[model samples]
Target: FRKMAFPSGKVEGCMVQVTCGTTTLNGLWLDDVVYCPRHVICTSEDMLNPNYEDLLIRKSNHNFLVQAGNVQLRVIGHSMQNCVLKLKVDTANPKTPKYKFVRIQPGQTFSVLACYNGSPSGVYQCAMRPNFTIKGSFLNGSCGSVGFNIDYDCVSFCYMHHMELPTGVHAGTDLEGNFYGPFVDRQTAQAAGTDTTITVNVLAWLYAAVINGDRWFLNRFTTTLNDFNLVAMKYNYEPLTQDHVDILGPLSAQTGIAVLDMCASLKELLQNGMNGRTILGSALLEDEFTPFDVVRQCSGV
Candidate 1:
């Protein structure tokens, strides 16, 4: 038997205690469980003098490739203390422009995904407010704080192009009905080989997607890059090439020049070794000459 509180009042003898052969509370079975609600309850004194060494904030996946709308943020809590933190978006304004009373547990991290939208142009800022109190609350302090900014102009191009494309003429769909000529298909390359060459091929298509501002292709290539990174981490493979670095380095600041340089370097890299002998060869050539030319001409590159 147990007592619980309700909106009306405290309810006594509401729960019936039973000595079952097996039972579960929260996520643990009766034999392996210790019911300690005090583990999560924080004292005011502990909240006031929290250990500050175990707090962190950074970009999710360590990539600034977020679009204009709906970006993700990551927060980490390393200390064995319970606290509340607030997140604020500096560029957004609405009924309310903040996230209040975000709870963080001891030695755990939280991801603020699907909660932010960047501006359509220029830079947007995101910050974390630690040790913030509202309405005379003392159990509302965090260990530390951090902030970061993202460029919207560079990242929003693909989304803009996605909106501009015709209703049926989209990436990952049959383009036979559309008259946009040819674009690289990323799925075929991954199905064909298991070498670093596939990475180069995917990079080539990713550059083309960025240059041409194709959202569908960009999404596909980014997913492939994530998968590649996972495999690289597991097997100790070099994650990215120097050319990839040079291409993505200037994206947030100088997009036009970066696209041009990326196209040229990707063109060269795709032609090296047996890359030109794979199914990705024709796709690379078509993208390099046709789509590459279209972007240069249309954007005056």
Candidate 2:
């Protein structure tokens, strides 16, 4: 009898056939059998209602029962806005309870597997933030009885925070009368733009490139920028390098011309070709050489 009730689905009736010996049915009668249902189904609308709390039960198709062992929570993000999902367990201690959370980008999924000593009468709650709604359901009662397997989907209405570049004077003159500028600060350049979607995509690509060890593009550019500042100070004629300039006129001219050309090339790439490539894509472009490269080659490298 216990085995029969263990499986799922509805059992209509049981059949019995007597062979001989004048078999007689004693306490086993038609109306003697009783059935109890223990399943709950919750939809997104149901969860939205503020009064729907007790409806949440530990059923196979609903929230899991708060028992012992480890449980797995699978959350799927279905909105443009980034999702922050949290799971908390209510305990006898009113102040604190076990909790965990995760951040998920759009179209991304996160899975959390945790172990717990099944606490009787404990409550479990799941929540999501940033203009998103969540729909949850448990896997199966048998699984929840020992542990748990739950699924949740967080949906959004395409809401997301806009990204924009930082605002301020990134470049400025340093002490000793050296000028730096015409270039933005590194932190400013990496800030989000007015378009978060595009900004995120660009950042993702840039991060991948850096992680893959393709940072020479940035390294060379930084070196050139530094050299430009140094040369600019000498060209300013603050203390006066008249003798050196006169003696090394050709060399000075060559250095100035190289710096100018490198700057021009970088400007063109930013203003035209790779403008929207990455957050700092405008600054770092694919290049075979800069003025520094030419000077190095001339120096017998």
Candidate 3:
């Protein structure tokens, strides 16, 4: 639900993975249920004062991997509730870029502002955003088959660097047949300057609240690290956890290298915290965050 994507009409040759599945990297593809629906909604606080920087890095690894002999992948049911958003990239601007200029430390300052320099890609990734959904049990098919079935709704998020602007029409034959809108995601501005622009991008990651958002800083960058140390099962694994915020926090806050790898590698900790159980109906409203135990989730629409 909250993982990789499979481009339309094509499946790659590699270990099966995608942004939406658990047991991602290398693991036993067993009866584990994953619930990490993809979302990038921004709260007012998230929009104004966010606090992490998690890049959208998962796999839509099309197809499944079953050994010729004994092992296999099995699931009771699978579901996909449309969470696609063809984001609006404001048209060209004649007005000069005003340095909004918000200072953090003492030396330098930056005006955190929305990117208005580029246009959105015209081609549709999931060509048809469906009102209809696909939710049912599946009889695991033959080997070498395309893992997830096609409804053309397997659109995953894309994060083109700032310089690599609109991936227009000629951007043909994208991953398989699906042409993801090359949006201005957070791949730029992490270089140089003691701190200014990139923090705003960090704000976007925090807004998503990759980890449960109990307090303001409750996110993958902070809380997850904390959990790694406290949770018994997770504590037994990976030396990645730390008591205080170190280089890892800010580093993962950017490219998402740390947390994402951890997700694929140490799944239990990630799964224990994620809640992808999904359901949608007529006249669906927005997500309301009451809470899901320690992990944050919507109890209602």
Candidate 4:
């Protein structure tokens, strides 16, 4: 059995004891479970020596393609479990003011700290503080679908997908719909080849040796390039013949040129590793790359 407490003020670190309801036989090995009391307790940590900056003061949005610096931002609040956030802007505004949209969960505390650069300046407010009821409930006004602006008759907007849910008080549309079943998930989608890969060559021919050294480029192009080279070699393809140059060589060159802008963007960022690291999740391998074995090998202890 358990005891219940209805404390007048905030309670901190109070321990309770559990007692067995019955006496056992003379030689019994006990393995018992007991019911406990219901209570709400709150605890807080002193932030005098916190490593990270406070919420609402940090900046997050910046363009790595332009300015070379860190634009930092932080999120802080209670009940943030299973919540997702996104940086949004009112594009209609001339300065394009941006805001942080947060989706919070019940009894969860959380925050997001990002550093970026090259973001345009304007008046902005961090707006969406979603209710806890929406974590998994089929509610339009839940955290997954932040139902902001009810006075204007706006619907809940999903933070990750940035899609508005079906509006109407009695509406109960599943976000992913019936297409996703109990066992189907992101991994299943990837295995089914629903994922996309976008590729660009970009100055690869001009600096083939250096480009070949890039880990990302090598991982993507190694097999594809080897197959192409093998097929060309098998056909005894000759280089620089007038007809061949006009067909194959120029095609390759054009494709490479099409990627020039992307390559320039990467190289420019690489030149300043500190700012690049900040904008790209603080390292050569961003958060997206953490699952790879190669990334694990390169990570520090």
lDDT of 4 by residue, 1-301 (tens): 0111112111111111211122110000011111111000101232222222232134233310111123122112211111111222212222211222233221211211111111111111111111211122222112121121111222221122111222211111122221111211121111121111111111222223222343233222222333433343333321112332222243335335323233333333333434432321224322111111111223331
> If ranked by lDDT, best first, what sequence of candidates would result?
3, 1, 2, 4
lDDT of each: 0.23, 0.22, 0.23, 0.20
Local lDDT at 235 for model 2: 31
TM-scores, one per candidate:
0.18, 0.20, 0.15, 0.16
Query: Which candidate, 2 or 3, has the higher lDDT?
Result: 3
**Cα lDDT of model 2 by residue, 223-285, tens digit:** 244444344344321111223124223333543423233333333433355534542233443
RMSD list, candidates in order: 24.2, 25.5, 23.9, 24.4
Name the candidate that leads on TM-score. 2
TM value for model 1: 0.18
The pairs that clash in candidate 4 are: 58-73, 59-72, 59-73, 62-117, 63-117, 71-116, 79-108, 80-108
Candidate 1 lDDT over 86-163, as tens digits, reads: 122122222221122222211111111111112111111111111111111111111111111112211100000100
Which lDDT value does model 4 have at 70?
32
Error of 1 at 274 (Å): 22
**lDDT pick, better of 3 and 4:** 3
TM-score of 3: 0.15
> lDDT at 17 for candidate 1?
15
Cα-lDDT of candidate 4: 0.20
